[PDB]
mmCIF file of C-alpha atoms and ligand atoms in Angstrom:
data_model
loop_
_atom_site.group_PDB
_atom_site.id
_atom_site.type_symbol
_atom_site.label_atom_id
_atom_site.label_comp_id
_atom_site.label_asym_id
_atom_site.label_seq_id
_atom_site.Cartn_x
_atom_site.Cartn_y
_atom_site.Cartn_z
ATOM 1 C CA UNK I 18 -33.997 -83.079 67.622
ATOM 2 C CA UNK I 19 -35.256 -82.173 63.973
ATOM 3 C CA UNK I 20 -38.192 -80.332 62.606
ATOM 4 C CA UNK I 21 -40.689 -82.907 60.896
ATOM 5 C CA UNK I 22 -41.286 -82.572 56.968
ATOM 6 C CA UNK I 23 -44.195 -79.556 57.229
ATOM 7 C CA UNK I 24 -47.314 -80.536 54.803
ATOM 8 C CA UNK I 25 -47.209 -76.480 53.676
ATOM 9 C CA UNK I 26 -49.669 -76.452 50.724
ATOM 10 C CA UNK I 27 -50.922 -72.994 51.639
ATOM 11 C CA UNK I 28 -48.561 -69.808 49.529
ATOM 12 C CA UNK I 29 -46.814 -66.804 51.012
ATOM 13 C CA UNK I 30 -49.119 -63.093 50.843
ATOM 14 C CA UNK I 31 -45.277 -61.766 51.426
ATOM 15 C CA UNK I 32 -44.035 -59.528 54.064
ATOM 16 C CA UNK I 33 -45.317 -56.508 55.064
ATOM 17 C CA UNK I 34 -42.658 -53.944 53.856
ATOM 18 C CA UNK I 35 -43.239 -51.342 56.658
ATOM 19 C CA UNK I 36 -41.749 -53.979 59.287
ATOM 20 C CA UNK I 37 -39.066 -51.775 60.745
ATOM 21 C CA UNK I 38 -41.592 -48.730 60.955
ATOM 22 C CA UNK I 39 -44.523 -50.808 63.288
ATOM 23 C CA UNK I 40 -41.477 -52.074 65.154
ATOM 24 C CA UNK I 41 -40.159 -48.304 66.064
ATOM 25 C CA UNK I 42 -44.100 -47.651 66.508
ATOM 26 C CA UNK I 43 -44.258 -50.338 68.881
ATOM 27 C CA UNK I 44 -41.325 -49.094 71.298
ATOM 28 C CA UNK I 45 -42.433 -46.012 70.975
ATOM 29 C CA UNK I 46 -45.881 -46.618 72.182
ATOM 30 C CA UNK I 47 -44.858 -48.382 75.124
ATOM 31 C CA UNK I 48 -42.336 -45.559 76.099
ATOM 32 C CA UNK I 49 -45.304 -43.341 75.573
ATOM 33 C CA UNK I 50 -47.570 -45.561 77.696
ATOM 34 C CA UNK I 51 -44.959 -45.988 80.598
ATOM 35 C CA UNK I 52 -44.337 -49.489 79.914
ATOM 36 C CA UNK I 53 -40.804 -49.942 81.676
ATOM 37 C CA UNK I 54 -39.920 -53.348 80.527
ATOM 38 C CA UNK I 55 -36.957 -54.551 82.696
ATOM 39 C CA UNK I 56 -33.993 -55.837 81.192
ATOM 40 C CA UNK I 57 -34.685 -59.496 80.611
ATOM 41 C CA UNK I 58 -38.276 -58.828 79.546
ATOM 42 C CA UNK I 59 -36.559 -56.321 76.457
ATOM 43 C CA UNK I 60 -33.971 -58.869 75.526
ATOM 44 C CA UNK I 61 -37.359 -61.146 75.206
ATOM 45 C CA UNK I 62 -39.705 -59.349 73.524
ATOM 46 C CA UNK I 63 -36.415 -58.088 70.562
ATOM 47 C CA UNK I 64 -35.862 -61.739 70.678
ATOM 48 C CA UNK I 65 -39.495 -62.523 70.328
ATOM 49 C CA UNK I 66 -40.161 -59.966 67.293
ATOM 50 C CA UNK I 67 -43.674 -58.801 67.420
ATOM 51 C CA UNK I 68 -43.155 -56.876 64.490
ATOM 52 C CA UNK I 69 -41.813 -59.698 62.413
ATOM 53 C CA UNK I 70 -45.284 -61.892 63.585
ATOM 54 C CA UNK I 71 -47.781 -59.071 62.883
ATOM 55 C CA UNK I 72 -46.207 -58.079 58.816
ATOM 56 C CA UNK I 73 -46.456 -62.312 58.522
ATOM 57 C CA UNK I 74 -49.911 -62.368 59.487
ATOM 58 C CA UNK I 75 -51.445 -58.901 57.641
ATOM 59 C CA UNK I 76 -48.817 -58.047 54.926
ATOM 60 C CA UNK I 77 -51.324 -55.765 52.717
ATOM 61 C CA UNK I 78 -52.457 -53.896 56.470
ATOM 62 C CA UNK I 79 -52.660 -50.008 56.088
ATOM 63 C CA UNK I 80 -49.144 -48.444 58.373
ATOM 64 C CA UNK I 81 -51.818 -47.227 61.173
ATOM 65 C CA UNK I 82 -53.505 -50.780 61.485
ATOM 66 C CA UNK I 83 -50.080 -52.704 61.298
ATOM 67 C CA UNK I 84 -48.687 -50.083 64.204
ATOM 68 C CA UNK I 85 -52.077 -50.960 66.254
ATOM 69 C CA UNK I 86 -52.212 -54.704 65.965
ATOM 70 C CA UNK I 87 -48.732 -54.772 66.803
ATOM 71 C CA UNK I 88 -49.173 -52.891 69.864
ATOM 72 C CA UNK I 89 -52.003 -55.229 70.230
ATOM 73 C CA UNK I 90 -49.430 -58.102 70.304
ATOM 74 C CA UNK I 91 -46.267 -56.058 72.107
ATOM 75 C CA UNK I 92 -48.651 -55.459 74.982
ATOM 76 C CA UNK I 93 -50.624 -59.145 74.914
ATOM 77 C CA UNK I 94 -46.328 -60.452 75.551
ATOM 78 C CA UNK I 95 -46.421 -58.475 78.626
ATOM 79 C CA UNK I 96 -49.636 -60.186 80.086
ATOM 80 C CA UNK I 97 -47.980 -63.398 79.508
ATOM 81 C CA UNK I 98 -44.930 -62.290 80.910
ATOM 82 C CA UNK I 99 -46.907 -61.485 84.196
ATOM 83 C CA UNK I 100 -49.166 -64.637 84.081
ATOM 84 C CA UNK I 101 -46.990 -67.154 82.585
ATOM 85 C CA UNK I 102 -43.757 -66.878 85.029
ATOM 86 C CA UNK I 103 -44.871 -64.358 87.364
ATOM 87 C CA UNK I 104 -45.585 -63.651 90.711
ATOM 88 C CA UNK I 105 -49.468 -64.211 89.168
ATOM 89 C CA UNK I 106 -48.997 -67.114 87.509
ATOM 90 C CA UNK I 107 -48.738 -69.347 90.660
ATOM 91 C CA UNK I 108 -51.101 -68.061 92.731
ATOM 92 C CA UNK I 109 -55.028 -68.748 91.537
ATOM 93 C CA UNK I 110 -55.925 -65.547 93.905
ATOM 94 C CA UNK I 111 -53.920 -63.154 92.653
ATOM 95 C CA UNK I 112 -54.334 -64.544 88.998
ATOM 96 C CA UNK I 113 -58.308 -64.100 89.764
ATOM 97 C CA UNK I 114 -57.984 -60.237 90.784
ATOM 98 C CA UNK I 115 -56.005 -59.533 88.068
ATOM 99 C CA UNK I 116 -57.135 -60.963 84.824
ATOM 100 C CA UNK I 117 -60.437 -59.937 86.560
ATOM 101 C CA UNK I 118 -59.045 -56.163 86.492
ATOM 102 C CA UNK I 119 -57.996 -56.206 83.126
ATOM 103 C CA UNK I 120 -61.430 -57.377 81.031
ATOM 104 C CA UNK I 121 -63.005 -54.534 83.514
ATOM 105 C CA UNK I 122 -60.541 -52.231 81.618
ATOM 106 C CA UNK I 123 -62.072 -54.159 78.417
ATOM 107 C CA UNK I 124 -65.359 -52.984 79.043
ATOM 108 C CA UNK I 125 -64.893 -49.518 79.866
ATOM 109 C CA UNK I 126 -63.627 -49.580 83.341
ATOM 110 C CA UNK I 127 -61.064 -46.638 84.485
ATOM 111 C CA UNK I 128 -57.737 -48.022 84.211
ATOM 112 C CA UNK I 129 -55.088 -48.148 86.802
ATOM 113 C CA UNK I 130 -51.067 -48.330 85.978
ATOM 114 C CA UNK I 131 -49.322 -48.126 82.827
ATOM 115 C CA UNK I 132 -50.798 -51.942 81.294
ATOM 116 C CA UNK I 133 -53.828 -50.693 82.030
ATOM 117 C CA UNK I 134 -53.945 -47.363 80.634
ATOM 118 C CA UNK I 135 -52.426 -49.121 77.593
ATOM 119 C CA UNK I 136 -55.312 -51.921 77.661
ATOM 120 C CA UNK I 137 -58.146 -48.954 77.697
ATOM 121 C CA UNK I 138 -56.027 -46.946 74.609
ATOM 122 C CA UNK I 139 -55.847 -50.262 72.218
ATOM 123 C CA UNK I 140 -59.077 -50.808 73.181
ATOM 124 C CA UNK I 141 -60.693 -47.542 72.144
ATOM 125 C CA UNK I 142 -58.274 -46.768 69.224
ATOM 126 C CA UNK I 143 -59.977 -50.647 67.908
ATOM 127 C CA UNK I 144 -63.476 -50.942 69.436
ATOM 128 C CA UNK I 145 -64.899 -47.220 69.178
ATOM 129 C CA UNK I 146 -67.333 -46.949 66.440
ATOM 130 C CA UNK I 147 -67.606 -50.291 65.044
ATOM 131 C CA UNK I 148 -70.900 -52.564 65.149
ATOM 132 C CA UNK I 149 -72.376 -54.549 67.882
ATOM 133 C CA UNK I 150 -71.659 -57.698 66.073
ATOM 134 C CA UNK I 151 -68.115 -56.810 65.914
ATOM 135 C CA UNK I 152 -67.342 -55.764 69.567
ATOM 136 C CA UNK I 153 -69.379 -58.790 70.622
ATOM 137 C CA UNK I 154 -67.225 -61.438 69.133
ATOM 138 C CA UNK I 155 -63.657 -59.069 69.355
ATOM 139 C CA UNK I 156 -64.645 -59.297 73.830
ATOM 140 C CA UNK I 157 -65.573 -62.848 73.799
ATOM 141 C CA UNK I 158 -62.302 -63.855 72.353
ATOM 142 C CA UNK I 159 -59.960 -61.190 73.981
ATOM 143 C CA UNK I 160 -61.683 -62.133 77.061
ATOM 144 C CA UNK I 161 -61.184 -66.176 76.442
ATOM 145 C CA UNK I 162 -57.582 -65.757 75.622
ATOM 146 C CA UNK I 163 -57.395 -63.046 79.224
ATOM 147 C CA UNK I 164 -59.287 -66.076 81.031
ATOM 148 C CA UNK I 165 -57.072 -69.136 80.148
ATOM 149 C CA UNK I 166 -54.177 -67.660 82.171
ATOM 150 C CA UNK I 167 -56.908 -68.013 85.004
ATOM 151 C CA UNK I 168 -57.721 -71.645 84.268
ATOM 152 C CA UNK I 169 -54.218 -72.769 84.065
ATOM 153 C CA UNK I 170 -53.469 -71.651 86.871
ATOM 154 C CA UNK I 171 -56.619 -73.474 88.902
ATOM 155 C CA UNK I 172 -55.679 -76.832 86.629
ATOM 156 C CA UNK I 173 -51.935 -76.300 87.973
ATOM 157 C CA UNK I 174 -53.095 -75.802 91.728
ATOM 158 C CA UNK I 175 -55.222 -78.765 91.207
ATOM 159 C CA UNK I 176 -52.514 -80.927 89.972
ATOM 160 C CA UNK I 177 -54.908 -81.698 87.087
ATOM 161 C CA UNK I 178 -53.317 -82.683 84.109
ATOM 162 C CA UNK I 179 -55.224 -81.527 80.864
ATOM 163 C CA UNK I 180 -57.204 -84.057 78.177
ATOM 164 C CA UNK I 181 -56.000 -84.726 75.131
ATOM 165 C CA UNK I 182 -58.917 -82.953 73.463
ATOM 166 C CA UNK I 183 -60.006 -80.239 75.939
ATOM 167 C CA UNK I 184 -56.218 -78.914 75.836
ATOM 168 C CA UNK I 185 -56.721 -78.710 72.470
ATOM 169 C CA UNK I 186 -60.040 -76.620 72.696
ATOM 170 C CA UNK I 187 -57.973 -74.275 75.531
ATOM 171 C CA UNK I 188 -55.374 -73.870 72.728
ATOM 172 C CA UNK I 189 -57.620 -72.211 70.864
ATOM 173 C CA UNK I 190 -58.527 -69.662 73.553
ATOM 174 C CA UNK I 191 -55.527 -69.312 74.199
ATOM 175 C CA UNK I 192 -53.661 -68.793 71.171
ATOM 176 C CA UNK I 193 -52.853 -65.706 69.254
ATOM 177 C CA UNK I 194 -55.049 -66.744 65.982
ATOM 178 C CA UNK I 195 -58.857 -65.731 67.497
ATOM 179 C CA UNK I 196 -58.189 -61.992 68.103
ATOM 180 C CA UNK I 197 -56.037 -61.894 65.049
ATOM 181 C CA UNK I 198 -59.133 -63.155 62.887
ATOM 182 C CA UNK I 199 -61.312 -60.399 64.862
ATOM 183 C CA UNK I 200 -58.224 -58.243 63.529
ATOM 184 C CA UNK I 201 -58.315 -59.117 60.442
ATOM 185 C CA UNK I 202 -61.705 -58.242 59.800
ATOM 186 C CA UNK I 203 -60.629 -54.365 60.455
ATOM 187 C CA UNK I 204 -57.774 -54.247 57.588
ATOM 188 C CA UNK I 205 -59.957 -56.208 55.122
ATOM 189 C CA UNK I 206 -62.821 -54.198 55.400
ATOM 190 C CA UNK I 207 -64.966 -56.443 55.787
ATOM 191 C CA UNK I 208 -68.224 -57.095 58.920
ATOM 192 C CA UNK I 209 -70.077 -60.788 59.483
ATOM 193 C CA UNK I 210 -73.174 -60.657 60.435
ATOM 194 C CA UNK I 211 -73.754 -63.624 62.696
ATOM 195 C CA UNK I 212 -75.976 -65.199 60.296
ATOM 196 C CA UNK I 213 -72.346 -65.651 58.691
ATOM 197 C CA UNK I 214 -70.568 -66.643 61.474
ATOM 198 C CA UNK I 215 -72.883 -69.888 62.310
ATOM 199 C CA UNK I 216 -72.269 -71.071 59.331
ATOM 200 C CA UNK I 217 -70.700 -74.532 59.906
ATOM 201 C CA UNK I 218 -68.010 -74.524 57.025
ATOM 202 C CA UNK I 219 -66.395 -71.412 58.451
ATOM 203 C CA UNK I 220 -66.864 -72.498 62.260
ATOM 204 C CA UNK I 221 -64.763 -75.147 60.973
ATOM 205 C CA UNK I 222 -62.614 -73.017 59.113
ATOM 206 C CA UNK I 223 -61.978 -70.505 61.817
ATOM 207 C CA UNK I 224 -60.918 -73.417 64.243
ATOM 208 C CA UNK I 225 -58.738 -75.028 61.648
ATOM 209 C CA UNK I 226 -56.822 -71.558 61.141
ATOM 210 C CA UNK I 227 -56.739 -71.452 64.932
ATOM 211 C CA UNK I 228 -55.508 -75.057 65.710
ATOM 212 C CA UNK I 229 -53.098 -74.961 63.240
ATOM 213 C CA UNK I 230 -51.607 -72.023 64.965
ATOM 214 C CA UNK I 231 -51.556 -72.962 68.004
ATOM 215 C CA UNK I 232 -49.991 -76.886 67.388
ATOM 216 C CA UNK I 233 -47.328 -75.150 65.252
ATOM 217 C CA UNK I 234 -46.473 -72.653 67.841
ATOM 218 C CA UNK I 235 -46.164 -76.352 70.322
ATOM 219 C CA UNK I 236 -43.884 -77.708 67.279
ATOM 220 C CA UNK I 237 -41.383 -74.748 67.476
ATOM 221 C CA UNK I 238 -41.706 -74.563 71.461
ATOM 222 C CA UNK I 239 -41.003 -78.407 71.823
ATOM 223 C CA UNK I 248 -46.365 -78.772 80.231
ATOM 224 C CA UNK I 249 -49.405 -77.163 78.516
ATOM 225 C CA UNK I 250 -47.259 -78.219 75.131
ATOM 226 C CA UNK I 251 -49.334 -80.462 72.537
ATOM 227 C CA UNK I 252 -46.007 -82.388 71.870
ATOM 228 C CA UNK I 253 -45.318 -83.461 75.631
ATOM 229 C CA UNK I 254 -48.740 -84.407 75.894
ATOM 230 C CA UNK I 255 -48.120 -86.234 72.604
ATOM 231 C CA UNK I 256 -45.081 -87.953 74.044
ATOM 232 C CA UNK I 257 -47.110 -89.111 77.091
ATOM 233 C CA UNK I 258 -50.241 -90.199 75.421
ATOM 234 C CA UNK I 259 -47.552 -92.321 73.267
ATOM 235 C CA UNK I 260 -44.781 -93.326 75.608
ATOM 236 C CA UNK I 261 -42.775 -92.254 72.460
ATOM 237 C CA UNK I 262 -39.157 -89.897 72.358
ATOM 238 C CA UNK I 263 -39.076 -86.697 71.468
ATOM 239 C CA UNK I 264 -38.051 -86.920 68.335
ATOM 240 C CA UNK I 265 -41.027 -89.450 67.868
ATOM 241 C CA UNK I 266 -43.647 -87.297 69.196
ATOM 242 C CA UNK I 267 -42.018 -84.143 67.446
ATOM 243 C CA UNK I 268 -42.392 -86.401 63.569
ATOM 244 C CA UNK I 269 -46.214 -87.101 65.320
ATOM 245 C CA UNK I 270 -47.127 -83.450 65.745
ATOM 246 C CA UNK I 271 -46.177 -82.873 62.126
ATOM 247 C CA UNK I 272 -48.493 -85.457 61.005
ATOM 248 C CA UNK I 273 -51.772 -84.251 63.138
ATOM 249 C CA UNK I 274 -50.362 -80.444 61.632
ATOM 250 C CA UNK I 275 -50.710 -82.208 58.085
ATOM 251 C CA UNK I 276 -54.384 -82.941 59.169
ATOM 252 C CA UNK I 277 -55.401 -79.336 60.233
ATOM 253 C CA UNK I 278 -53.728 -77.758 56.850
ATOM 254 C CA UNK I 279 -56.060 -80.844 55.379
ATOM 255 C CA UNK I 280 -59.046 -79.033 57.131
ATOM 256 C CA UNK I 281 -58.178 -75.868 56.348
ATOM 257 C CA UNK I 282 -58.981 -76.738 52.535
ATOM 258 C CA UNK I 283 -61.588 -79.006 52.791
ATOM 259 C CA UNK I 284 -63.434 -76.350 55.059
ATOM 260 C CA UNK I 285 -62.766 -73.575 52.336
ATOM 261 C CA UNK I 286 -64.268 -75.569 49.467
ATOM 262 C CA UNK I 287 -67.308 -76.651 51.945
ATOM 263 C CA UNK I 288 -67.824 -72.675 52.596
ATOM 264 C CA UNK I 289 -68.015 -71.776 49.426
ATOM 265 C CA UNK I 290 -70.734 -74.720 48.645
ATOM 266 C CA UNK I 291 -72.568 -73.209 51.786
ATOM 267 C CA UNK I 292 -72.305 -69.893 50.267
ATOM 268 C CA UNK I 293 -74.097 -70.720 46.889
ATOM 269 C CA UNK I 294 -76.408 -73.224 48.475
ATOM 270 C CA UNK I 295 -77.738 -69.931 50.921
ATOM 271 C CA UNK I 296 -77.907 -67.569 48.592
ATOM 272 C CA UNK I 297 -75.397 -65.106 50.251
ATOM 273 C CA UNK I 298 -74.583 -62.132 47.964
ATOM 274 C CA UNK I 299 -73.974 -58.510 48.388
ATOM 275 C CA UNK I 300 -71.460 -57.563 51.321
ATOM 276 C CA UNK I 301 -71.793 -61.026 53.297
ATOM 277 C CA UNK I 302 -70.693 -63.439 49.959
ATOM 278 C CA UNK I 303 -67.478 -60.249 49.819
ATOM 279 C CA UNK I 304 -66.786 -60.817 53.100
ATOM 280 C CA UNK I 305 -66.886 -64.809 53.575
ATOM 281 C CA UNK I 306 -65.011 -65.126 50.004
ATOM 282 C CA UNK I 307 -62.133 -62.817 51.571
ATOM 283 C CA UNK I 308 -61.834 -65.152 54.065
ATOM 284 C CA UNK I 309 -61.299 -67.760 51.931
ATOM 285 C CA UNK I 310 -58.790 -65.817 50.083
ATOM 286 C CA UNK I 311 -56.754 -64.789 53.176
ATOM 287 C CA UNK I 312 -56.748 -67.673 55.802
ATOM 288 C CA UNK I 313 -54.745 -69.455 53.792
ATOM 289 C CA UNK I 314 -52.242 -66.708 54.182
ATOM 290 C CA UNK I 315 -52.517 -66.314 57.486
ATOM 291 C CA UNK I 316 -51.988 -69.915 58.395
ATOM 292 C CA UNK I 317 -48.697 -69.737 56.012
ATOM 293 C CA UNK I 318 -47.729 -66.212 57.638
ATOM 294 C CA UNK I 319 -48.123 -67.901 61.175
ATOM 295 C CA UNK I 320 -45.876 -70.876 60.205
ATOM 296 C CA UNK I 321 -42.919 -69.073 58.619
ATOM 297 C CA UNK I 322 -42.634 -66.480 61.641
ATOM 298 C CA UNK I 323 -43.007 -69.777 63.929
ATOM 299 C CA UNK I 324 -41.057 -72.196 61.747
ATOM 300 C CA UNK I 325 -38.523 -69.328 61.360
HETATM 301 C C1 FPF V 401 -56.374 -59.195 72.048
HETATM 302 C C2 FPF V 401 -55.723 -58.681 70.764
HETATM 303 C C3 FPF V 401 -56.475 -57.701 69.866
HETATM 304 C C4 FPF V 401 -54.514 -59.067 70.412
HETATM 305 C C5 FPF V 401 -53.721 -60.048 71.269
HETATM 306 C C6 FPF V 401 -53.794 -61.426 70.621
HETATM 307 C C7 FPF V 401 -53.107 -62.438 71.530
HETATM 308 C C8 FPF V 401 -53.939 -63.426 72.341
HETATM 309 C C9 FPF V 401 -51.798 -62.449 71.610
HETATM 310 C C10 FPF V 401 -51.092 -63.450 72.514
HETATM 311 C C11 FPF V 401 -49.590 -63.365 72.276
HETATM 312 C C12 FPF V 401 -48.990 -64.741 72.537
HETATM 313 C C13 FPF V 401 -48.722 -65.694 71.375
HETATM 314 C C14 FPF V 401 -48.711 -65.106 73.767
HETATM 315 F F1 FPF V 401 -48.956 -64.257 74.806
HETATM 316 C C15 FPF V 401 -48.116 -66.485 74.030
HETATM 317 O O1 FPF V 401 -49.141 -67.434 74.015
HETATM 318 P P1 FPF V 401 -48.766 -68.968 73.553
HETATM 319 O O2 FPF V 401 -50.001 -69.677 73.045
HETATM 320 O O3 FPF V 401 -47.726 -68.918 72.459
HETATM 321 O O4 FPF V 401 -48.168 -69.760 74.870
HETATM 322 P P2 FPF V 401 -46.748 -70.596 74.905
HETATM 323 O O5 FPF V 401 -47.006 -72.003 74.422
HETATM 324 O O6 FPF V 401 -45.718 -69.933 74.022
HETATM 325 O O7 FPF V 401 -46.226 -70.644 76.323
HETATM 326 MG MG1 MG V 402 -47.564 -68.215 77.086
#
């Protein structure tokens, strides 16, 4: 099996050149935390590179917010660990309690073991001090992602198998991308007001950064997989469906532009200025470098 030809139109922002400092920070902070990773769970998450992921994604980060996302993403591979093909993962019950537990840790709730003491420290190293619009849209998609482990595991006891669409509106939840964009807003220094984030062009935008994320993470991971539902809608092989995902990526890279140049007409045709016009026109400078940063750690 081959990799399809990859539509990449999008150009590098480069590598964050503090890499093998946030990855010592990382290890670090989960010795500190008591986060005992056993033996094949290490040789995963070296294998995995968090650190290689989170310099891809915000290369111009300040050291402290690089060392604090990637904790954000060392410590989101150990809730998968324990959700995807764990003792929780089968079992809808224990699943429930859990995740359950752990967005009660979100909110303020007194944490219990070493994942979530380290929940309750990334949470008020990020959250503490930062506006109301912020905290409400960094929850509901930290929350979303925390709650998809739940609803796979109810569509698995069911036997349900998921739609074509719908699993690709759970990708989203469930994908790396949302809290990233929540993250991003921290190292750019920029705040959307909501007025700004109902905008339609960067709804769409958002999604298309998100989607494209998620499908190439499917691509390089080739279940809940867009290709093998690909290769069933289809009746095609492998290497058929594989050459199909690249096309539909083609079309999300396609709406990553086309929603950038309709933001910007959105922008002028509202009269956004001062902060919000900064803010929205960063995004259109930067998604396209986080969609590129996301495919090269994926791709590669
Ligand atoms: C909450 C904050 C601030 C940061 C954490 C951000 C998130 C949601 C990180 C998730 C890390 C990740 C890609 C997984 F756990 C795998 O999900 P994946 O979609 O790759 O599933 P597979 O298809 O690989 O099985
Ligand atoms: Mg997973």
């Amino acid at each position: 099996i081959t990799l399809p030809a990859f539509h990449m139109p999008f150009q590098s922002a480069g590598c964050h050149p503090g890499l093998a400092e946030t990855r010592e920070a990382a290890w670090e902070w989960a010795a500190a935390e008591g986060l005992d990773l056993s033996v094949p769970a290490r040789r995963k998450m070296i294998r995995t590179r968090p650190e290689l992921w989170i310099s891809l994604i915000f290369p111009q980060a300040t050291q402290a917010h690089l060392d604090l996302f990637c904790q954000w993403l060392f410590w989101a591979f150990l809730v998968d660990d324990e959700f995807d093909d764990g003792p929780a993962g089968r079992d809808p019950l224990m699943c429930e309690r859990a995740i359950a537990r752990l967005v009660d840790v979100f909110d303020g709730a007194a944490p219990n073991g070493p994942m979530e003491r380290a929940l309750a420290g990334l949470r008020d190293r990020t959250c503490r001090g930062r506006s109301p619009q912020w905290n409400r849209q960094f929850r509901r998609d930290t929350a979303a992602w925390l709650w998809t482990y739940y609803a796979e595991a109810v569509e698995r006891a069911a036997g349900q198998v998921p739609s074509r669409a719908e699993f690709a509106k759970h990708r989203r939840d469930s994908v790396a991308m949302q809290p990233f964009l929540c993250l991003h807003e921290i190292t750019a220094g920029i705040d959307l007001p909501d007025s700004a984030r109902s905008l339609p062009a960067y709804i769409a935008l958002r999604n298309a950064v998100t989607d494209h994320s998620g499908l190439c993470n499917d691509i390089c991971s080739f279940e809940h997989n867009a290709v093998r539902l690909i290769q069933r809608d289809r009746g095609s092989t492998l290497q058929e469906a594989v050459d199909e995902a690249g096309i539909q990526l083609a079309r999300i890279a396609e709406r990553v532009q086309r929603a950038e140049r309709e933001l910007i007409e959105e922008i002028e045709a509202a009269g956004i200025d001062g902060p919000t016009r900064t803010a929205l026109e960063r995004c259109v400078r930067d998604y396209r470098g986080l969609v590129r940063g996301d495919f090269d750690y994926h791709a590669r």
